[PDB]
Motif scaffolding. Structure first.
Motif, PDB file in Angstrom:
ATOM      1  N   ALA A  67     -40.772 -30.376  22.614  1.00  0.00           N
ATOM      2  CA  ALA A  67     -41.112 -31.589  21.880  1.00  0.00           C
ATOM      3  C   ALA A  67     -41.038 -31.354  20.373  1.00  0.00           C
ATOM      4  O   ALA A  67     -40.151 -31.880  19.700  1.00  0.00           O
ATOM      5  CB  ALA A  67     -42.493 -32.075  22.279  1.00  0.00           C
ATOM      6  N   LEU A  68     -41.973 -30.557  19.848  1.00  0.00           N
ATOM      7  CA  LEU A  68     -41.972 -30.248  18.422  1.00  0.00           C
ATOM      8  C   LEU A  68     -40.834 -29.300  18.061  1.00  0.00           C
ATOM      9  O   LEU A  68     -40.028 -29.600  17.167  1.00  0.00           O
ATOM     10  CB  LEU A  68     -43.341 -29.695  17.998  1.00  0.00           C
ATOM     11  N   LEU A  69     -40.710 -28.187  18.788  1.00  0.00           N
ATOM     12  CA  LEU A  69     -39.571 -27.301  18.613  1.00  0.00           C
ATOM     13  C   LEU A  69     -38.275 -27.954  19.062  1.00  0.00           C
ATOM     14  O   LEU A  69     -37.210 -27.589  18.559  1.00  0.00           O
ATOM     15  CB  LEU A  69     -39.793 -25.997  19.375  1.00  0.00           C
ATOM     16  N   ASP A  70     -38.356 -28.943  19.955  1.00  0.00           N
ATOM     17  CA  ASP A  70     -37.172 -29.689  20.366  1.00  0.00           C
ATOM     18  C   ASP A  70     -36.594 -30.492  19.207  1.00  0.00           C
ATOM     19  O   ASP A  70     -35.397 -30.409  18.927  1.00  0.00           O
ATOM     20  CB  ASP A  70     -37.514 -30.604  21.542  1.00  0.00           C
ATOM     21  N   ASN A  71     -37.431 -31.264  18.506  1.00  0.00           N
ATOM     22  CA  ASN A  71     -36.902 -32.049  17.394  1.00  0.00           C
ATOM     23  C   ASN A  71     -36.571 -31.170  16.193  1.00  0.00           C
ATOM     24  O   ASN A  71     -35.670 -31.513  15.416  1.00  0.00           O
ATOM     25  CB  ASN A  71     -37.867 -33.174  17.005  1.00  0.00           C
ATOM     26  N   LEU A  72     -37.334 -30.088  16.013  1.00  0.00           N
ATOM     27  CA  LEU A  72     -37.065 -29.155  14.887  1.00  0.00           C
ATOM     28  C   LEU A  72     -35.674 -28.560  15.116  1.00  0.00           C
ATOM     29  O   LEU A  72     -34.881 -28.519  14.158  1.00  0.00           O
ATOM     30  CB  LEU A  72     -38.140 -28.064  14.877  1.00  0.00           C
ATOM     31  N   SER A  73     -35.387 -28.186  16.367  1.00  0.00           N
ATOM     32  CA  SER A  73     -34.072 -27.617  16.762  1.00  0.00           C
ATOM     33  C   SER A  73     -32.984 -28.672  16.545  1.00  0.00           C
ATOM     34  O   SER A  73     -31.899 -28.314  16.049  1.00  0.00           O
ATOM     35  CB  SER A  73     -34.109 -27.161  18.196  1.00  0.00           C
ATOM     36  N   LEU A  74     -33.296 -29.932  16.869  1.00  0.00           N
ATOM     37  CA  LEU A  74     -32.330 -31.054  16.729  1.00  0.00           C
ATOM     38  C   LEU A  74     -31.938 -31.201  15.255  1.00  0.00           C
ATOM     39  O   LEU A  74     -30.735 -31.386  14.983  1.00  0.00           O
ATOM     40  CB  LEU A  74     -32.996 -32.333  17.245  1.00  0.00           C
ATOM     41  N   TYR A  75     -32.908 -31.087  14.342  1.00  0.00           N
ATOM     42  CA  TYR A  75     -32.602 -31.211  12.893  1.00  0.00           C
ATOM     43  C   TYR A  75     -31.635 -30.086  12.507  1.00  0.00           C
ATOM     44  O   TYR A  75     -30.636 -30.356  11.813  1.00  0.00           O
ATOM     45  CB  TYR A  75     -33.893 -31.135  12.075  1.00  0.00           C
ATOM     46  N   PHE A  76     -31.916 -28.868  12.982  1.00  0.00           N
ATOM     47  CA  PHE A  76     -31.036 -27.697  12.733  1.00  0.00           C
ATOM     48  C   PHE A  76     -29.695 -27.936  13.437  1.00  0.00           C
ATOM     49  O   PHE A  76     -28.636 -27.629  12.856  1.00  0.00           O
ATOM     50  CB  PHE A  76     -31.692 -26.407  13.233  1.00  0.00           C
ATOM     51  N   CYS A  77     -29.758 -28.514  14.641  1.00  0.00           N
ATOM     52  CA  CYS A  77     -28.554 -28.781  15.471  1.00  0.00           C
ATOM     53  C   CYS A  77     -27.607 -29.730  14.728  1.00  0.00           C
ATOM     54  O   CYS A  77     -26.392 -29.448  14.720  1.00  0.00           O
ATOM     55  CB  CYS A  77     -28.961 -29.408  16.800  1.00  0.00           C
ATOM     56  N   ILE A  78     -28.137 -30.780  14.092  1.00  0.00           N
ATOM     57  CA  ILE A  78     -27.266 -31.693  13.363  1.00  0.00           C
ATOM     58  C   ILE A  78     -26.905 -31.104  12.008  1.00  0.00           C
ATOM     59  O   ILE A  78     -25.814 -31.360  11.491  1.00  0.00           O
ATOM     60  CB  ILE A  78     -27.880 -33.103  13.246  1.00  0.00           C
ATOM     61  N   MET A  79     -27.751 -30.228  11.460  1.00  0.00           N
ATOM     62  CA  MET A  79     -27.390 -29.595  10.200  1.00  0.00           C
ATOM     63  C   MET A  79     -26.297 -28.552  10.381  1.00  0.00           C
ATOM     64  O   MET A  79     -25.372 -28.471   9.565  1.00  0.00           O
ATOM     65  CB  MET A  79     -28.633 -29.018   9.543  1.00  0.00           C
ATOM     66  N   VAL A  80     -26.351 -27.774  11.461  1.00  0.00           N
ATOM     67  CA  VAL A  80     -25.282 -26.804  11.658  1.00  0.00           C
ATOM     68  C   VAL A  80     -24.016 -27.450  12.206  1.00  0.00           C
ATOM     69  O   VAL A  80     -22.947 -26.840  12.125  1.00  0.00           O
ATOM     70  CB  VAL A  80     -25.694 -25.629  12.563  1.00  0.00           C
ATOM     71  N   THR A  81     -24.086 -28.660  12.775  1.00  0.00           N
ATOM     72  CA  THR A  81     -22.819 -29.302  13.112  1.00  0.00           C
ATOM     73  C   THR A  81     -22.261 -30.130  11.962  1.00  0.00           C
ATOM     74  O   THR A  81     -21.064 -30.431  11.967  1.00  0.00           O
ATOM     75  CB  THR A  81     -22.933 -30.174  14.371  1.00  0.00           C
ATOM     76  N   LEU A  82     -23.077 -30.485  10.965  1.00  0.00           N
ATOM     77  CA  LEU A  82     -22.568 -31.184   9.794  1.00  0.00           C
ATOM     78  C   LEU A  82     -22.138 -30.245   8.682  1.00  0.00           C
ATOM     79  O   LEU A  82     -21.311 -30.633   7.851  1.00  0.00           O
ATOM     80  CB  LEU A  82     -23.616 -32.162   9.250  1.00  0.00           C
ATOM     81  N   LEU A  83     -22.677 -29.036   8.655  1.00  0.00           N
ATOM     82  CA  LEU A  83     -22.279 -27.963   7.755  1.00  0.00           C
ATOM     83  C   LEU A  83     -20.781 -27.611   7.760  1.00  0.00           C
ATOM     84  O   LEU A  83     -20.295 -27.195   6.702  1.00  0.00           O
ATOM     85  CB  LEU A  83     -23.142 -26.729   8.069  1.00  0.00           C
ATOM     86  N   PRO A  84     -20.012 -27.706   8.869  1.00  0.00           N
ATOM     87  CA  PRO A  84     -18.557 -27.472   8.731  1.00  0.00           C
ATOM     88  C   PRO A  84     -17.825 -28.459   7.833  1.00  0.00           C
ATOM     89  O   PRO A  84     -17.146 -28.023   6.892  1.00  0.00           O
ATOM     90  CB  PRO A  84     -18.059 -27.547  10.176  1.00  0.00           C
ATOM     91  N   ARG A  85     -17.941 -29.768   8.097  1.00  0.00           N
ATOM     92  CA  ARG A  85     -17.228 -30.769   7.302  1.00  0.00           C
ATOM     93  C   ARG A  85     -17.736 -30.794   5.868  1.00  0.00           C
ATOM     94  O   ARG A  85     -16.948 -30.900   4.917  1.00  0.00           O
ATOM     95  CB  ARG A  85     -17.374 -32.154   7.934  1.00  0.00           C
ATOM     96  N   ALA A  86     -19.051 -30.657   5.703  1.00  0.00           N
ATOM     97  CA  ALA A  86     -19.639 -30.604   4.374  1.00  0.00           C
ATOM     98  C   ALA A  86     -19.197 -29.359   3.622  1.00  0.00           C
ATOM     99  O   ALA A  86     -18.926 -29.420   2.417  1.00  0.00           O
ATOM    100  CB  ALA A  86     -21.155 -30.641   4.491  1.00  0.00           C
ATOM    101  N   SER A  87     -19.078 -28.232   4.327  1.00  0.00           N
ATOM    102  CA  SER A  87     -18.695 -26.988   3.678  1.00  0.00           C
ATOM    103  C   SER A  87     -17.244 -27.028   3.229  1.00  0.00           C
ATOM    104  O   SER A  87     -16.930 -26.608   2.108  1.00  0.00           O
ATOM    105  CB  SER A  87     -18.926 -25.813   4.622  1.00  0.00           C
ATOM    106  N   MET A  88     -16.347 -27.550   4.078  1.00  0.00           N
ATOM    107  CA  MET A  88     -14.951 -27.628   3.662  1.00  0.00           C
ATOM    108  C   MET A  88     -14.760 -28.675   2.577  1.00  0.00           C
ATOM    109  O   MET A  88     -13.921 -28.486   1.692  1.00  0.00           O
ATOM    110  CB  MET A  88     -14.010 -27.924   4.833  1.00  0.00           C
ATOM    111  N   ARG A  89     -15.567 -29.744   2.583  1.00  0.00           N
ATOM    112  CA  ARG A  89     -15.457 -30.742   1.528  1.00  0.00           C
ATOM    113  C   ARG A  89     -15.940 -30.192   0.193  1.00  0.00           C
ATOM    114  O   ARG A  89     -15.312 -30.429  -0.846  1.00  0.00           O
ATOM    115  CB  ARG A  89     -16.230 -32.001   1.919  1.00  0.00           C
ATOM    116  N   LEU A  90     -17.014 -29.404   0.206  1.00  0.00           N
ATOM    117  CA  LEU A  90     -17.507 -28.848  -1.048  1.00  0.00           C
ATOM    118  C   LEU A  90     -16.607 -27.732  -1.562  1.00  0.00           C
ATOM    119  O   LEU A  90     -16.392 -27.625  -2.776  1.00  0.00           O
ATOM    120  CB  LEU A  90     -18.946 -28.360  -0.894  1.00  0.00           C
ATOM    121  N   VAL A  91     -16.050 -26.905  -0.673  1.00  0.00           N
ATOM    122  CA  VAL A  91     -15.156 -25.869  -1.180  1.00  0.00           C
ATOM    123  C   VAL A  91     -13.799 -26.451  -1.547  1.00  0.00           C
ATOM    124  O   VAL A  91     -13.090 -25.866  -2.371  1.00  0.00           O
ATOM    125  CB  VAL A  91     -14.958 -24.691  -0.207  1.00  0.00           C
TER     126      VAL A  91
END
Lengths: 50, 23, 98, 287, 46, 313
Positions: free
Chosen positions: D186-210
């Motif tokens: 529940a709590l670690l579930d949503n905390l993981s979800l925030y990390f889950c969407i951050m590490v899946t958004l980090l590729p497109r964001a990383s290539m856009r920033l570089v």
């Protein structure tokens, strides 16, 4: 001039102490009125129980 | 040291009214 | 109305003092009355060794006074005393009635 | 200055309340006084789910406090100034360690909800003390619980990919300064979800920033050396997406990276100086 | 046991002063008597 | 014969008005000297708690000189050398063994000889001359090459601020270090303290730029690490960027030849703030001499050691 300022400061401290004493004298009546309102069942109860 | 420039006037004995040694 | 008679047992404690106990034999103790006055953590020692008068060799020597220094420890003991507020407000106002 | 705060309890108390404050005198609790909102007792109420980000942002919102005494009706406690040092014990349901750690952490107890929540039937205030633990212990247990709940939800999606024995061999055993500790759930579930969407958004964001900062310094040693490292599989698929969806992705990406960076920073950061084993206490100041 | 208790001081020792007795030169008899006291105390135990 | 701009009587009574009250003695010697102290105590509480002018007078009369916390360590007297200076910033390496009655700390010369043993000017010969064998500090640390392979050497070194009190014993030397707050002398009386940093491991960041905080800087040079100490009056939160810029000409220039694996070795150094000294007093260079030769040393007075965490560059 500093005598006037120091007398004004003494009046400030005396007004603050009187404010504190008056705050207790009203807070004591507030706690008494809270206790008297906490041990008071309403009259639609005590018209039959009494 | 610390006594490299100061004069000493008297001393304070640890109740040694006849003894001179001690502290 | 005297309703009931209860007995309680307080605990007698053998209260000790440093002069009353026996290890004060080891330490010649003073009352320095303000420990901020001494301003050096070391204390100079004047060790004066006497001499033995030999005669056959005729090899005299004076008292070989040599001086060493040694540290002064300091400690800091602390406790709390729990006095009640109402007892101090009683103590401030001297009563006259029994 | 008396840093002590007074709290009047509502009704009269009894024996094991005194026993559990004697258990919890050394440990600490946050702040908002009002006997309902003393600490985390407004997040651990079971009519809502006990979440981690709401409790963490509340804990970073309010201050902290050291419980000191509980009489028949009073709750004598002092709070935390950044100025002077106070004394702290463990008194915690996990009894972890103090081996000279110069950096501390204060996190809500992920090891047990009821392990730190103390309950009174006469007083429904259900107060609770967040687990104080050293910083390598803190980062190791937060990794070993975040990846554990990630694996649990992934097995719940598809059990054929991840197992439990090889992850309980490693991700259940924190080990720090010679000491080998054990933890598993529940709590670690949503905390993981925030990390889950951050590490899946980090590729497109990383290539856009570089790709935005790739040729600013037109011949840099440092920029070319950070460009030579990363993934050749990554830097292809950027120009296909529309503008507004891309910038909304980057905006949500930046919000939750700032949130997870401040969350991976250990919140209330205490610091100890000298720990006494025989009394189980150390001196601490706020840092 | 040679005993069961020991006589010790009831209070701490206090620091006494010694050296700045700044009385004047009294006479020749005082300085001669004190010189004889300081030097003949070499051979006398009591 | 004439009148000064200041009368001595007015300044005298102003100092007598702004004087702190004396600390309360309590004679435990005589009961006649005890009852007056307890009567003074109950009169002090009465005139400090009763609701009158006495309470606000005594409340304004109070000044808040808080004593700092101290770190008592037990180190091996052979693994240390008492001939070094007093105000040396010590670095307690974390010992993972619980079956260790002592701990181990590090002067900058000791970790300097550890970095030189892991792989100069006059300070390397001074450190070889002070600590004669790097093998002692080499097998003192359990895992030196492994922990520098995985590059977690920084969180295993916790700086404990400067050294003030250091006794000298045969076995198991005891040291006392101030950790939080102002550096001050505790057992030896509270008069004055300095902080000795080796000048060759201490560079000014603002002179390279061309309050006063002090930053300890680990760097992982590609043949073996090094400590450096950084002084800057700039921001507590804008110290990472400028030091990133400072270590920028070295990092890829020596990082072209190395490539990591089993992934480690990405963290290039880590930095903590030791604390702050005042902007009023600068740092005054002096000379640190062992019995062989001398070395330049930097004295920093009036430090307020507030050790932060190591932050990766």
């Amino acid at each position: 001039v500093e005598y006037a300022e120091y007398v004004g400061a003494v009046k400030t401290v005396a007004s603050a102490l009187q404010f504190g004493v008056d705050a207790l004298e009203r807070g004591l009546i507030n706690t008494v009125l809270s206790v008297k309102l906490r041990h008071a069942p309403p009259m639609f109860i005590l018209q039959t129980l009494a | 040291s610390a006594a490299e420039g100061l004069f000493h006037s008297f001393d304070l004995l640890v109740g040694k009214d006849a003894r001179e040694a001690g502290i | 109305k005297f309703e009931v008679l209860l007995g309680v047992y307080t605990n007698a404690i053998q209260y000790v003092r440093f002069l009353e106990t026996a290890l004060a034999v080891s330490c010649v103790n003073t009352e320095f009355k303000d420990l901020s006055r001494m301003t050096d953590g070391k204390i100079q020692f004047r060790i004066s060794v006497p001499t033995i008068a030999h005669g056959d060799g005729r090899r005299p020597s004076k008292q070989r006074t040599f001086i060493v220094v040694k540290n002064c420890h300091k400690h800091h003991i602390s406790t709390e005393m729990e006095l009640s507020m109402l007892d101090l407000e009683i103590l401030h106002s001297i009563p006259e009635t029994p | 200055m008396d840093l002590k705060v007074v709290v009047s309890l509502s009704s009269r108390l009894y024996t094991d309340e005194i026993a559990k404050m004697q258990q919890r005198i050394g440990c600490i609790l946050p702040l908002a006084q009002n006997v309902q909102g003393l600490g985390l007792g407004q997040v651990y109420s079971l009519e809502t789910v006990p979440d981690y980000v709401s409790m963490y942002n509340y804990l970073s919102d309010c201050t902290l406090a050291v419980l000191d005494e509980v009489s028949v009706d009073s709750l004598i406690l002092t709070k935390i100034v950044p100025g002077q040092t106070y004394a702290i014990k463990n008194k915690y349901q996990p009894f972890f360690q103090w081996h000279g750690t110069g950096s501390l952490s204060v996190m809500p107890p992920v090891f047990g909800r009821e392990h730190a929540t103390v309950k009174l039937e006469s007083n429904d205030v259900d107060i609770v003390f967040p687990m104080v633990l050293p910083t390598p212990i803190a980062e190791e247990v937060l990794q070993k619980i975040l990846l554990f709940n990630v694996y649990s939800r992934v097995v719940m999606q598809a059990p054929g990919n991840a197992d439990m024995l090889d992850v309980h061999m490693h991700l259940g055993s924190v080990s720090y300064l010679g000491h080998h500790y054990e933890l598993a759930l529940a709590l670690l579930d949503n905390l993981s979800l925030y990390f889950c969407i951050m590490v899946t958004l980090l590729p497109r964001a990383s290539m856009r920033l570089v790709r935005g900062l790739i040729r600013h310094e037109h011949h840099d040693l440092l920029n070319l050396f950070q460009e030579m490292v990363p993934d050749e599989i990554a830097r292809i698929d950027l120009d296909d997406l529309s503008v507004a969806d891309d910038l909304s992705r980057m905006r949500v990406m930046m919000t939750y990276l700032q949130s997870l960076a401040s969350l991976f920073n250990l919140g209330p950061r205490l610091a100890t100086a000298a720990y006494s084993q025989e009394t189980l206490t150390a001196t601490c100041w706020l840092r | 046991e040679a005993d069961n208790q020991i006589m010790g001081p009831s209070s701490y020792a206090s620091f006494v002063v010694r050296g700045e007795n700044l009385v004047t030169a009294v006479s020749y008899g005082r300085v001669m008597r004190t010189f004889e006291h300081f030097m003949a105390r070499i051979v006398d135990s009591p | 014969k004439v009148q000064g701009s200041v009368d001595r009587r007015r300044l005298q009574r102003r100092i007598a008005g702004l004087l702190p009250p004396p600390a309360r003695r309590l004679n435990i010697s005589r009961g006649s000297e005890f009852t007056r102290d307890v009567r003074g105590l109950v009169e002090e509480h009465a005139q400090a708690s009763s609701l009158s002018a006495a309470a606000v007078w005594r409340a304004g009369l109070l000044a808040p000189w808080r004593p700092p916390v101290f770190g008592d360590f037990l180190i091996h007297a052979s693994s240390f050398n008492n001939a070094e200076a007093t105000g040396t910033p010590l670095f307690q390496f974390k010992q993972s063994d619980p079956f260790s009655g002592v701990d181990a700390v590090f002067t900058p010369l000791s970790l300097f000889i550890l970095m030189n043993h892991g792989r100069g000017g006059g300070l390397t010969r001074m450190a070889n001359l002070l600590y004669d064998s790097p093998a002692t500090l080499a097998d003192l640390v359990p895992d030196f090459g492994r922990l520098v392979a995985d590059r977690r050497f920084h969180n295993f070194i916790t700086p404990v601020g400067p050294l003030v009190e250091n006794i000298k014993s045969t076995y198991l030397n005891k040291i006392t270090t101030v950790v939080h707050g102002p550096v001050v002398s505790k057992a030896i009386p509270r008069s004055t303290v300095k902080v000795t940093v080796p000048q060759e491991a201490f560079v000014d960041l603002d002179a390279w730029l061309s309050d006063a905080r002090l930053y300890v800087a680990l760097t992982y040079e590609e043949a073996g690490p090094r400590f450096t100490f950084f002084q800057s009056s700039r921001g507590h939160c804008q110290i990472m960027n400028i030091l990133r810029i400072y270590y920028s000409p070295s990092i890829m220039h020596r990082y072209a030849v190395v490539q990591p694996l089993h992934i480690e070795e990405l963290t290039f150094g880590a930095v903590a703030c030791l604390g702050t000294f005042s902007a009023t007093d600068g740092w005054r260079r002096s000379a640190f001499n062992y019995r062989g030769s001398s070395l330049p040393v930097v004295e920093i007075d009036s430090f307020y050691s507030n050790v932060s965490d190591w932050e990766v560059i």
